[PDB]
Amino acid sequence: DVALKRKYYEEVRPELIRRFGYQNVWEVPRLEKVVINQGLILEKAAQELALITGQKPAVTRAGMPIGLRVTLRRDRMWIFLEKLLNVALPGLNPNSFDGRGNYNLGLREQGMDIAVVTTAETDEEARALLELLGFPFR
């Protein structure tokens, strides 16, 4: 299955426990979902986004159609993130957390807005989660 997911359970979760003193494993910050929005024919862009995420994009409308959105959870989230980190990005802004433990990245390369939503309640906990998963910050 997914190496990044295995890295979470084997490496990241125990380090977070040591670092923050969570007394049960279900308290430890987890990835919840990754939402990708691509602003805007539409059929080609939807097919490319479908190919890269493995999931059917919804059409965001003002329609008039204005963008494409996909909410990735579970294995599709992990598989997409493994690609983003290992293939696409080859540092991220460490200040781009939303104040509630979620990370925001806007790309105008290879605009695409990515929200990494976590169960961390603080930016600090979320930053540690993502850094330990291998997100390149600084």
Add this chain to the structure above:
RNA sequence: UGCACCUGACCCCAUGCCGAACUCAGAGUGCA
């Protein structure tokens, strides 16, 4: 302007109960 977060339900719409979800709305946080 958009997505995410946040907070709600006059309004289109919604729950085979629940504005949880879906829909919609809004001076604030993040990014583009």
